[PDB]
Amino acid sequence: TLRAAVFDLDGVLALPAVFGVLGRTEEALALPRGLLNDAFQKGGPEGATTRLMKGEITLSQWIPLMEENCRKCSETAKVCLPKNFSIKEIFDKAISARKINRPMLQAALMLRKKGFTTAILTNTWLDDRAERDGLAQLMCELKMHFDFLIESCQVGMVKPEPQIYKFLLDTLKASPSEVVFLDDIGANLKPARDLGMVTILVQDTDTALKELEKVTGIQLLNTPAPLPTSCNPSDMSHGYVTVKPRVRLHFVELGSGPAVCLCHGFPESWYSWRYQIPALAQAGYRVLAMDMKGYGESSAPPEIEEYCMEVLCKEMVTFLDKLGLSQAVFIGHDWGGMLVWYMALFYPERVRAVASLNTPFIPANPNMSPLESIKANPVFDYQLYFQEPGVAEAELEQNLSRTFKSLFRASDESVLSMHKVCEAGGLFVNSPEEPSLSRMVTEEEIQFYVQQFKKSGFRGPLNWYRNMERNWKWACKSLGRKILIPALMVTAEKDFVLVPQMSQHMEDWIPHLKRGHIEDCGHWTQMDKPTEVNQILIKWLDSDAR
Amino acid sequence: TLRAAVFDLDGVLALPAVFGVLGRTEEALALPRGLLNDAFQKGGPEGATTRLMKGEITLSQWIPLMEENCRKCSETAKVCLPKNFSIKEIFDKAISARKINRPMLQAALMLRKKGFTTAILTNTWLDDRAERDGLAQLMCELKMHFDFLIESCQVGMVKPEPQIYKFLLDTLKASPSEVVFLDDIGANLKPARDLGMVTILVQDTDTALKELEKVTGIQLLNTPAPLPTSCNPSDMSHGYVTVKPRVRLHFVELGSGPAVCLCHGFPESWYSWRYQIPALAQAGYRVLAMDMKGYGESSAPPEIEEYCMEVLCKEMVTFLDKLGLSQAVFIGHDWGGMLVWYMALFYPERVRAVASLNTPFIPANPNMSPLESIKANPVFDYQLYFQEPGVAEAELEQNLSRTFKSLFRASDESVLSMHKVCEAGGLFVNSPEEPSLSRMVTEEEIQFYVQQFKKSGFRGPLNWYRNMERNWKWACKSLGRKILIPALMVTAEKDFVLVPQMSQHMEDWIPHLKRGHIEDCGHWTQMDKPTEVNQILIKWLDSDAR
Ligand SMILES: C[C@@H]1CN=C(NCCc2ccccc2)S1
Ligand SMILES: C[C@@H]1CN=C(NCCc2ccccc2)S1
Ligand SMILES: [Mg+2]
Ligand SMILES: [Mg+2]
């Protein structure tokens, strides 16, 4: 029956509402009760406020008309307004006070997840105040979650006029009995009710969601903690920079503020950051989520030495040069983690701060060839498997879906053993033809990786492992240095390859190192525990990169 | 003979040099002359400074070693260092004092313009100080102008060691007698001279350029004012955002800081901003230079109504939404100028500030259909010529090179008359088959426009002119508003279509409007007078958008 849900902004999706400042201002200032509301509503359908709400005039032009209405109301109530009484002041403060009502947004999100069309229908204004950006940010953050935002001042109609409900219906392509409409103003619900819409009068949020749950039959209250917002690839800004004649890097870009470059691991994608990209943008940063060289829409030349760390890092510096960025924050996971540590040691002037998920910083041992070093740790045997060009490419390319479904697994889900892979003859020799789907991913998300990896396959990616000696010689150049820029290491309890204890000496090289640690988290940290990753990264960004 | 030129950084491309702070610090503080230089050079080839310069240790690790050397030197000279004597302090201050030496950079640029390979060869350090960004910015700004930057600390070798000169030669693919090398340190020139390079010992800049002019035979001093830096399309970051199913917008992006969206006119390109993009990025902004809808790499659907202002503006808001930008500064020229005024009137919450080149803001007349309004001004007759779909497309597409060479002309160069175009039968009916090249453009730059316009031709572009009635009805909705966000109008003396006097009433609608005016400037403002445009935009950005 019900197929659509419509939410007001003031007092429904955002709180405290702004007439709640008309009320509170009267109280705080000991003015005649309702005086500010009288001024606000003066002249009714043709008074200043309606002209505002219909987009006839801007907020800045309205402010002095409200001033005049206040003067008139207080003359007629035979009172004075206090010295320094300021309408601009009151509204600036009310409008910045007003925050997203998180439980109501989460109900709308959930109803949209079960197939509802959702909309915001609000009486609002053209905001040209000096501080208008605050409201622009709120509306951006809210509206991306809905099918439609209908604003009185853009459509030239206002609640409770009946035409705006007809316009709503026509936008929804729904009939009234398929629609629930929530508002904190009863006079605003009446015309929706007249048309036979389900309406809910919102006072406290919980009771409104109780009514909303009853009428839609979906669970909205007491529901588990939802995942952070993810990214839809076709809604992102896609960027492309040529770093040298045969090599272009692709990235996705979202947000404003200090540049934050995310560097994914093997065998992954920009999309491995999908849960971090919207949260970090929301947190005040300019995210650049790379396809690393070898992957996705970035170039993948065939030659092994195109993937040594020296070359990869120089190219990442060029990438900053061509975008006109003097620095970025570098945040890496897995191979990308190893890369950002080398960015910090070789190009500290270009790195505002550095963070790694899982990958520890371990200085090259100048007394042991990296082959031997690798051979001293049974868990790294898969790295020898990767050496011989073509062997791992053929196994990994043979069935892409099976490849990603086998790799991308939570720590409780039959993770592959990295155990005597060479001896066994391959990574999947002991895994099923058709693995089950991890709880971490959807079938759609697996097919995104499959489709990315059909462009270049696994050659470029595997080549990252094929420069052990060359990277060892380059790293030995840095053995006298310390990392003294702001630095964060995030360990994962159940990553059984990049174990938390392998990071234990990092303070000898990075004395002011900060740490986070995520429990019950396997190797695929960003999608295993996206919520915790986001909280640990934002907290460290705000204190150390800002 | 000479084919390459090599410049030192300290004391050659940037001034004051930093040993000049060792000297000045001794004087300011009344220490024994040369004491700070002794500390700095202590231990020679194996002392702390050389290890710094070779990339063995970072600047932050070196600071306390220099401290120790200072202590040792002052013990042996039987003196005390003052209380609060700080090496970090001295160097922070020296390194921010140091600016690009503009005449030396302009000589290097000019030699590169006449075919020299240019390089910077410098002894420098890995900079991990809290304030390292300042130096990162300087190096970015300088290095983009050269073929090679060779840094002692990246290559592990230092002037005056002879191996760094062999490495230089091998980088240049030149023999020593084809190379001139400039340095302010004589001991550094000696090995270049030993190999038979032309060397110049730089004390004052003018005398060094005098020597440089004599030896290369090119004029470097007293030369006219050069153009601002332009953009090479294949060195830019290219971005792409889908704003709706059939419509993607392309833009080029350079810089960090407040977002500044540049909107070009008819029939132009992002590339029309090529002189502004590097200067505005350099000035502290994040430039987004659009292909407007209809042009270049943006989508060009065929339908007329896809190009009405309402649709164009809504799409530009979506473009900000998808990039996660709550606002941008909008700067428009020509049609793009008209568009940004409507962004300011319909979406002031999304526009941080608005500026137009040439295009005035004129409110719709609700008592006169826009056809009649257009017919009341002989100079607008070309707009009627554009109405009939296919007529202007066939003339403009018929020979693209002739099209752009005829349009893009300085005010002194036989500009087309916009005079009775319909009567005449077309825009070019009275222009040559092969126009000469304007002084404003190169033949290469014309062929960039030609190549852009081969993708979609002139249909989409012309469609901007084909929604007169629809835009008039939308504009009438805004007749009660004023523009009260920060706003700049820039008039061009000799634009004979968008005349400066057509802007004369703008203050009635935009009471706090700021202005600039460019004399002896025709219609193609950004390439006619790029230097003046840049100065007027940066000055207004820094005061009003920041
Ligand atoms: C610097 C270190 C190099 N190898 C790393 N982990 C790869 C994890 C992995 C993923 C998938 C299959 C096998 C292994 S990061
Ligand atoms: C809003 C105004 C609409 N027409 C404008 N100028 C087009 C200039 C022009 C360029 C090339 C040929 C003819 C004319 S801006
Ligand atoms: Mg409300
Ligand atoms: Mg020097």
Side-chain angles (χ1 to χ4, degrees):
Chain A
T1 171
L2 283 196
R3 249 211 309 117
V6 187
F7 299 77
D8 188 16
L9 174 79
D10 217 41
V12 173
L13 278 165
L15 293 170
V18 326
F19 321 154
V21 123
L22 295 185
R24 226 173 316 101
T25 297
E26 279 153 15
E27 287 233 347
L29 287 181
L31 305 161
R33 288 190 172 294
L35 170 321
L36 296 190
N37 294 119
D38 303 335
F40 189 87
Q41 288 141 244
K42 200 134 175 17
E46 64 261 320
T49 295
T50 292
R51 299 212 310 121
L52 212 222
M53 293 301 200
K54 286 205 161 164
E56 292 173 36
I57 60 158
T58 75
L59 179 62
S60 290
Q61 309 171 272
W62 167 96
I63 285 172
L65 290 14
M66 169 68 162
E67 286 279 349
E68 180 45 17
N69 295 355
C70 285
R71 207 197 86 8
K72 276 231 279 289
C73 289
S74 83
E75 187 193 327
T76 182
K78 280 139 101 282
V79 307
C80 287
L81 304 151
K83 222 142 42 55
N84 288 354
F85 174 73
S86 175
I87 295 293
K88 178 228 185 339
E89 253 269 69
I90 284 159
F91 277 91
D92 277 345
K93 193 149 57 159
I95 292 163
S96 47
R98 155 232 245 180
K99 300 299 195 276
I100 286 173
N101 177 7
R102 292 294 157 178
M104 187 68 69
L105 208 200
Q106 111 161 249
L109 259 18
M110 168 71 63
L111 286 178
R112 187 134 96 131
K113 216 198 338 177
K114 317 275 187 161
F116 279 57
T117 296
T118 63
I120 302 174
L121 174 68
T122 175
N123 284 355
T124 181
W125 49 87
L126 293 169
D127 198 332
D128 58 349
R129 287 142 62 230
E131 316 67 12
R132 70 198 170 280
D133 189 48
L135 174 127
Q137 289 172 6
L138 181 90
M139 295 302 303
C140 279
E141 182 180 359
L142 265 167
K143 78 200 262 210
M144 69 183 287
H145 299 295
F146 290 78
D147 306 292
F148 303 100
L149 169 57
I150 288 159
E151 291 173 285
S152 61
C153 55
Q154 288 313 336
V155 300
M157 298 183 277
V158 293
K159 303 185 301 200
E161 306 170 331
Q163 51 180 6
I164 199 156
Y165 310 76
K166 305 287 188 152
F167 175 82
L168 172 63
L169 292 165
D170 178 61
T171 304
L172 292 162
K173 296 190 178 105
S175 36
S177 70
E178 291 179 297
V179 181
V180 46
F181 176 40
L182 315 241
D183 199 306
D184 59 341
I185 289 134
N188 287 353
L189 285 173
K190 190 185 99 60
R193 229 188 353 276
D194 290 344
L195 251 14
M197 290 176 89
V198 170
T199 53
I200 288 154
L201 207 212
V202 174
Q203 284 162 220
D204 66 298
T205 295
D206 279 321
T207 311
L209 302 174
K210 252 156 282 186
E211 296 184 29
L212 186 55
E213 226 173 10
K214 288 170 240 226
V215 81
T216 64
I218 297 155
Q219 226 177 63
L220 300 178
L221 230 24
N222 317 134
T223 221
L227 288 163
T229 304
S230 191
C231 287
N232 177 359
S234 74
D235 296 327
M236 311 304 297
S237 186
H238 288 262
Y240 300 85
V241 171
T242 300
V243 291
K244 66 200 211 193
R246 278 160 218 87
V247 185
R248 92 188 335 181
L249 299 182
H250 164 246
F251 57 109
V252 147
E253 185 166 40
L254 180 73
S256 54
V260 174
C261 180
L262 308 180
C263 298
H264 68 69
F266 172 91
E268 309 190 47
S269 169
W270 72 262
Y271 189 59
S272 293
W273 302 98
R274 61 198 173 274
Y275 294 113
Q276 283 64 235
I277 293 159
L280 300 196
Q282 196 58 57
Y285 296 92
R286 190 221 290 194
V287 179
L288 310 153
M290 314 291 307
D291 278 333
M292 303 299 288
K293 188 187 192 167
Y295 290 88
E297 304 186 49
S298 295
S299 304
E303 294 91 357
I304 287 161
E305 339 63 265
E306 284 286 309
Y307 298 87
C308 77
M309 207 43 78
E310 190 176 352
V311 169
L312 295 167
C313 293
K314 281 172 165 41
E315 286 175 0
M316 284 310 290
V317 170
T318 299
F319 169 80
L320 299 182
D321 292 341
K322 303 224 183 161
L323 261 170
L325 297 177
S326 58
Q327 299 185 320
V329 177
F330 287 77
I331 304 189
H333 166 252
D334 188 74
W335 262 114
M338 180 84 290
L339 175 148
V340 303
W341 298 122
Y342 284 86
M343 300 287 303
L345 279 171
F346 284 81
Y347 302 101
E349 76 285 358
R350 306 317 290 278
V351 183
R352 172 60 264 239
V354 55
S356 178
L357 308 188
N358 313 41
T359 311
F361 171 64
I362 302 175
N365 176 342
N367 301 303
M368 226 191 274
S369 73
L371 216 62
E372 187 172 19
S373 298
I374 283 149
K375 292 186 210 185
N377 188 144
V379 91
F380 295 154
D381 172 72
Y382 75 86
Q383 308 194 200
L384 308 169
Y385 176 66
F386 289 177
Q387 305 292 311
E388 174 48 28
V391 180
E393 280 88 330
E395 176 182 44
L396 293 152
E397 292 166 12
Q398 186 247 62
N399 176 343
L400 293 167
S401 177
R402 172 184 189 221
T403 292
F404 292 104
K405 290 183 165 169
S406 300
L407 292 171
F408 301 166
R409 304 196 71 91
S411 66
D412 60 5
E413 294 175 319
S414 283
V415 307
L416 302 159
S417 73
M418 297 304 143
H419 191 77
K420 299 197 262 211
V421 176
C422 289
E423 189 189 278
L427 220 40
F428 304 142
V429 298
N430 275 300
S431 350
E433 256 331 292
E434 296 187 323
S436 53
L437 219 222
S438 166
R439 56 84 167 174
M440 294 187 308
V441 281
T442 57
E443 179 60 39
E444 290 61 47
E445 291 168 332
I446 289 303
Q447 301 300 320
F448 181 88
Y449 289 87
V450 163
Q451 142 226 308
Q452 298 295 294
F453 278 82
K454 278 175 173 183
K455 318 148 169 298
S456 306
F458 272 80
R459 187 173 176 146
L462 285 154
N463 274 354
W464 284 62
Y465 286 92
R466 293 178 184 150
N467 287 277
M468 289 323 176
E469 294 278 324
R470 197 187 265 115
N471 304 342
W472 174 80
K473 293 202 173 96
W474 187 64
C476 285
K477 301 191 182 179
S478 74
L479 283 171
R481 341 223 269 229
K482 285 173 182 203
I483 291 173
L484 295 176
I485 66 190
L488 176 74
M489 172 77 208
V490 182
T491 47
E493 177 179 28
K494 300 191 169 173
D495 184 333
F496 296 122
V497 181
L498 305 175
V499 306
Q501 94 164 350
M502 272 174 76
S503 77
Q504 69 193 340
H505 303 310
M506 284 176 62
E507 285 82 347
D508 304 341
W509 291 81
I510 318 188
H512 302 295
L513 184 70
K514 295 207 175 171
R515 292 188 169 265
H517 173 78
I518 306 177
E519 261 145 18
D520 201 36
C521 181
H523 178 68
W524 312 100
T525 306
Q526 300 96 309
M527 50 168 145
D528 195 323
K529 290 290 190 288
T531 293
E532 298 79 354
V533 169
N534 285 181
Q535 166 272 316
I536 286 164
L537 291 173
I538 294 163
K539 171 208 137 89
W540 169 80
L541 289 172
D542 286 342
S543 69
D544 285 55
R546 175 58 99 155
Chain B
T1 171
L2 283 196
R3 249 211 309 117
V6 187
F7 299 77
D8 188 16
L9 174 79
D10 217 41
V12 173
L13 278 165
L15 293 170
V18 326
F19 321 154
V21 123
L22 295 185
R24 226 173 316 101
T25 297
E26 279 153 15
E27 287 233 347
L29 287 181
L31 305 161
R33 288 190 172 294
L35 170 321
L36 296 190
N37 294 119
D38 303 335
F40 189 87
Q41 288 141 244
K42 200 134 175 17
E46 64 261 320
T49 295
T50 292
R51 299 212 310 121
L52 212 222
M53 293 301 200
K54 286 205 161 164
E56 292 173 36
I57 60 158
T58 75
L59 179 62
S60 290
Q61 309 171 272
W62 167 96
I63 285 172
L65 290 14
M66 169 68 162
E67 286 279 349
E68 180 45 17
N69 295 355
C70 285
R71 207 197 86 8
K72 276 231 279 289
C73 289
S74 83
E75 187 193 327
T76 182
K78 280 139 101 282
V79 307
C80 287
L81 304 151
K83 222 142 42 55
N84 288 354
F85 174 73
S86 175
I87 295 293
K88 178 228 185 339
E89 253 269 69
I90 284 159
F91 277 91
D92 277 345
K93 193 149 57 159
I95 292 163
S96 47
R98 155 232 245 180
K99 300 299 195 276
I100 286 173
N101 177 7
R102 292 294 157 178
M104 187 68 69
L105 208 200
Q106 111 161 249
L109 259 18
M110 168 71 63
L111 286 178
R112 187 134 96 131
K113 216 198 338 177
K114 317 275 187 161
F116 279 57
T117 296
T118 63
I120 302 174
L121 174 68
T122 175
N123 284 355
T124 181
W125 49 87
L126 293 169
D127 198 332
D128 58 349
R129 287 142 62 230
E131 316 67 12
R132 70 198 170 280
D133 189 48
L135 174 127
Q137 289 172 6
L138 181 90
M139 295 302 303
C140 279
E141 182 180 359
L142 265 167
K143 78 200 262 210
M144 69 183 287
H145 299 295
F146 290 78
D147 306 292
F148 303 100
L149 169 57
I150 288 159
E151 291 173 285
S152 61
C153 55
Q154 288 313 336
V155 300
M157 298 183 277
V158 293
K159 303 185 301 200
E161 306 170 331
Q163 51 180 6
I164 199 156
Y165 310 76
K166 305 287 188 152
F167 175 82
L168 172 63
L169 292 165
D170 178 61
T171 304
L172 292 162
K173 296 190 178 105
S175 36
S177 70
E178 291 179 297
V179 181
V180 46
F181 176 40
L182 315 241
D183 199 306
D184 59 341
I185 289 134
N188 287 353
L189 285 173
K190 190 185 99 60
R193 229 188 353 276
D194 290 344
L195 251 14
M197 290 176 89
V198 170
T199 53
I200 288 154
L201 207 212
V202 174
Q203 284 162 220
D204 66 298
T205 295
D206 279 321
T207 311
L209 302 174
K210 252 156 282 186
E211 296 184 29
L212 186 55
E213 226 173 10
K214 288 170 240 226
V215 81
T216 64
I218 297 155
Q219 226 177 63
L220 300 178
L221 230 24
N222 317 134
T223 221
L227 288 163
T229 304
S230 191
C231 287
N232 177 359
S234 74
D235 296 327
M236 311 304 297
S237 186
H238 288 262
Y240 300 85
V241 171
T242 300
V243 291
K244 66 200 211 193
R246 278 160 218 87
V247 185
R248 92 188 335 181
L249 299 182
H250 164 246
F251 57 109
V252 147
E253 185 166 40
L254 180 73
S256 54
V260 174
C261 180
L262 308 180
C263 298
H264 68 69
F266 172 91
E268 309 190 47
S269 169
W270 72 262
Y271 189 59
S272 293
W273 302 98
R274 61 198 173 274
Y275 294 113
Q276 283 64 235
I277 293 159
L280 300 196
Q282 196 58 57
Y285 296 92
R286 190 221 290 194
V287 179
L288 310 153
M290 314 291 307
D291 278 333
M292 303 299 288
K293 188 187 192 167
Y295 290 88
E297 304 186 49
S298 295
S299 304
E303 294 91 357
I304 287 161
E305 339 63 265
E306 284 286 309
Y307 298 87
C308 77
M309 207 43 78
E310 190 176 352
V311 169
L312 295 167
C313 293
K314 281 172 165 41
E315 286 175 0
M316 284 310 290
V317 170
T318 299
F319 169 80
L320 299 182
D321 292 341
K322 303 224 183 161
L323 261 170
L325 297 177
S326 58
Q327 299 185 320
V329 177
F330 287 77
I331 304 189
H333 166 252
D334 188 74
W335 262 114
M338 180 84 290
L339 175 148
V340 303
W341 298 122
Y342 284 86
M343 300 287 303
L345 279 171
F346 284 81
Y347 302 101
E349 76 285 358
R350 306 317 290 278
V351 183
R352 172 60 264 239
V354 55
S356 178
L357 308 188
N358 313 41
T359 311
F361 171 64
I362 302 175
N365 176 342
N367 301 303
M368 226 191 274
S369 73
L371 216 62
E372 187 172 19
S373 298
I374 283 149
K375 292 186 210 185
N377 188 144
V379 91
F380 295 154
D381 172 72
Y382 75 86
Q383 308 194 200
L384 308 169
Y385 176 66
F386 289 177
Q387 305 292 311
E388 174 48 28
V391 180
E393 280 88 330
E395 176 182 44
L396 293 152
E397 292 166 12
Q398 186 247 62
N399 176 343
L400 293 167
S401 177
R402 172 184 189 221
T403 292
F404 292 104
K405 290 183 165 169
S406 300
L407 292 171
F408 301 166
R409 304 196 71 91
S411 66
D412 60 5
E413 294 175 319
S414 283
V415 307
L416 302 159
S417 73
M418 297 304 143
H419 191 77
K420 299 197 262 211
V421 176
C422 289
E423 189 189 278
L427 220 40
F428 304 142
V429 298
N430 275 300
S431 350
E433 256 331 292
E434 296 187 323
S436 53
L437 219 222
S438 166
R439 56 84 167 174
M440 294 187 308
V441 281
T442 57
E443 179 60 39
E444 290 61 47
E445 291 168 332
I446 289 303
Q447 301 300 320
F448 181 88
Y449 289 87
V450 163
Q451 142 226 308
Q452 298 295 294
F453 278 82
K454 278 175 173 183
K455 318 148 169 298
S456 306
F458 272 80
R459 187 173 176 146
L462 285 154
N463 274 354
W464 284 62
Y465 286 92
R466 293 178 184 150
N467 287 277
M468 289 323 176
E469 294 278 324
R470 197 187 265 115
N471 304 342
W472 174 80
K473 293 202 173 96
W474 187 64
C476 285
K477 301 191 182 179
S478 74
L479 283 171
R481 341 223 269 229
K482 285 173 182 203
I483 291 173
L484 295 176
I485 66 190
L488 176 74
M489 172 77 208
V490 182
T491 47
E493 177 179 28
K494 300 191 169 173
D495 184 333
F496 296 122
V497 181
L498 305 175
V499 306
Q501 94 164 350
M502 272 174 76
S503 77
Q504 69 193 340
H505 303 310
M506 284 176 62
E507 285 82 347
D508 304 341
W509 291 81
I510 318 188
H512 302 295
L513 184 70
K514 295 207 175 171
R515 292 188 169 265
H517 173 78
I518 306 177
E519 261 145 18
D520 201 36
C521 181
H523 178 68
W524 312 100
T525 306
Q526 300 96 309
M527 50 168 145
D528 195 323
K529 290 290 190 288
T531 293
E532 298 79 354
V533 169
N534 285 181
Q535 166 272 316
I536 286 164
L537 291 173
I538 294 163
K539 171 208 137 89
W540 169 80
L541 289 172
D542 286 342
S543 69
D544 285 55
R546 175 58 99 155

